[PDB]
Design a protein around this ligand. Sequence first.
Ligand SMILES: NC1CCCCCC1
Ligand SMILES: [Ca+2]
Length: 223
Amino acid sequence: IVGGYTCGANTVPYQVSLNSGYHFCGGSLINSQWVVSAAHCYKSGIQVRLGEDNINVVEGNEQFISASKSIVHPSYNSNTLNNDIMLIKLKSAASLNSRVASISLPTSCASAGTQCLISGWGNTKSSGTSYPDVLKCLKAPILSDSSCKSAYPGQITSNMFCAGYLEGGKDSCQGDSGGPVVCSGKLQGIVSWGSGCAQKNKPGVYTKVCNYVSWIKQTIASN
Ligand SMILES: NC1CCCCCC1
Ligand SMILES: [Ca+2]
């Protein structure tokens, strides 16, 4: 997260870190045994880490649970990043509490102008590289489809939205991939892609979660 703030320990209780020897992606806990992330975060040997703040220190509220299976969206295209969504099932159910909690799926799509919270352990520099070890947060508005399409001609599908600031300086970045965009207590987006981070006229692009609720519910119900 570039241009954000330190969230505060366990203030984003649905935020998970995906770990394969090291943090490589974010995710969102949507019930006691399922996590939503980006399809481009797919790999084998995933351990889900819940209750994290400093991802380099065991602080006492963590639960570490290996994934039993991952399900990438059947229509995911890794070239265009259309349908950039994946479900991860935990080998055992997380113990839910005030610091480890699921986030509700949307019942309706959020509109341009809606204020959202984007979070993660990604790069905090738009040119350099610096990884925070504590969770970072950014408040950002959803942008209009027209401005999103104008920023990225030929690349924005009906399964994507832009959020952030056309002026630059505030954005999600490398390592935030797969993480939450939460608006009014609902998971509306997944950190997906962009052209660099926090660059002028290149806002972050996010998977439009409201388009996938039926798929998520049906997949969970049979897996
Ligand atoms: N806003 C994006 C975050 C996902 C990874 C690519 C960098 C920029
Ligand atoms: Ca920790």
